[PDB]
């Protein structure tokens, strides 16, 4: 029982996840750090 209604706010948006880059604080560095 799936509706075909819809919403202005369920349009696609921010469809890519940012990942924490090499210098910002990647889980590798924090795995290292003291």
């Amino acid at each position: 029982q799936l509706s075909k209604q819809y919403s202005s706010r369920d349009l696609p948006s921010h469809t890519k996840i940012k990942y924490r880059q090499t210098t910002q604080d990647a889980p590798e560095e924090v795995r290292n750090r003291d």
């Binding site: 706010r9 948006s13 921010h14 996840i17 940012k18 889980p27 924090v30």
Partner: protein, 320 residues
């Protein structure tokens, strides 16, 4: 009896931050350990420096009490959750909300993040939890089955992947994929507002005004009690060295030994000048990333920082 507990040094208060205009209800530390973030009942989110205690920034989007914050270890995101039934995703390269998760039917009491996959879990007062997809804002599961507000949720990578404690005095261990409860633990007599997972031991503990209890994964087999703290317990927080902090709602804070369950310190801090004495209470506590500092968020609008005491020894402070 028991073998005898390991000796841990005791902790002493060394800083008192005060800039909030309502109770402080949640606290969290960044991955890289430079700043922490507090959310309060004055509907702001303040971001403080962890070395100096200076306030860096103030984010104001919510409409009511912010009851949980968390900072994601994989992406530059801060997820906040309020009593306005709304859950937000702040992107910390612009300091602005970019995503909002809709669908809860009453205040959201707490929230946790999955450590490997990109999902969110939120618990609310409609007595459900929801598993959100971080990227498409779509609710992939509504974990239902409690019969009263769901006070707390914690999630892990191992199995079972979600533990919720609720106000109908029950704990449930759920599976993330199937989306239904494997185990129901009914040992507590009063609301379970606090749950914590040991970092390196496949065990967990759950706090209630009766007593804290320890349980053993993955089907929650009872292990032992921890008694003595007779107070509404708002938080539990475990160090990697087996220190377990139990913060109550009348202000008193006990520090225990995790393994043997021996309460080695009791802190009863003082209320900020202009406060009543009926307004001492701890709502959240968080260990630093180095596990050296212990920050607490209190009902007198202050943040108190404890550090370990370096000039004490087994003979100065013996273990009973």
């Amino acid at each position: 009896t028991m073998p005898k507990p390991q000796w841990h040094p005791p902790w002493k208060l060394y800083r008192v931050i005060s800039g909030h205009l309502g109770w402080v209800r949640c606290i969290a530390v960044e991955p890289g350990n430079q700043w922490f973030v507090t959310g309060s009942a004055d509907r702001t989110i303040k971001i403080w420096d962890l070395a100096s205690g200076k306030l860096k920034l103030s984010l104001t989007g919510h409409i009511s009490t912010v009851r949980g914050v968390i900072v994601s270890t994989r992406s530059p995101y801060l997820f906040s959750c309020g009593e306005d039934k709304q859950v937000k995703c702040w992107d910390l390269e612009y300091n602005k909300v970019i995503r909002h998760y809709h669908g809860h039917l009453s205040a959201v009491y707490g929230l946790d993040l999955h450590p490997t996959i990109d999902v969110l879990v939120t618990c609310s007062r409609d007595s459900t939890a929801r598993i959100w997809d971080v990227r498409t804002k779509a609710s992939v599961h509504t974990l239902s089955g409690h019969t009263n507000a769901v006070a707390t949720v914690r999630c892990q990578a191992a199995e079972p992947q979600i533990i919720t404690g609720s106000h109908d005095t029950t704990i449930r261990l759920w599976d993330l994929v199937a989306g239904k409860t494997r185990v129901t633990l009914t040992n507590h007599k009063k609301s379970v507002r606090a749950v914590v997972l040991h970092p390196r031991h496949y065990t967990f503990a759950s706090g209630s005004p009766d007593n804290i209890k320890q349980w053993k994964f993955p089907d929650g087999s009872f292990i032992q009690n921890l008694s003595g703290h007779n107070a509404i317990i708002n938080t539990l927080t475990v160090n990697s060295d087996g220190v377990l902090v139990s913060g109550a709602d009348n202000g008193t804070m006990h520090l225990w030994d995790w393994r043997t369950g021996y309460n080695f310190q009791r802190v009863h801090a003082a209320v900020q000048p202009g406060s009543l004495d009926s307004e001492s209470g701890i709502f959240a506590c968080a260990f630093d990333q180095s596990e050296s500092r212990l920050l607490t968020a209190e009902a007198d609008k202050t943040i108190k920082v404890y550090r370990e005491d370096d000039t004490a020894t087994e003979e100065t402070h013996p273990v009973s």
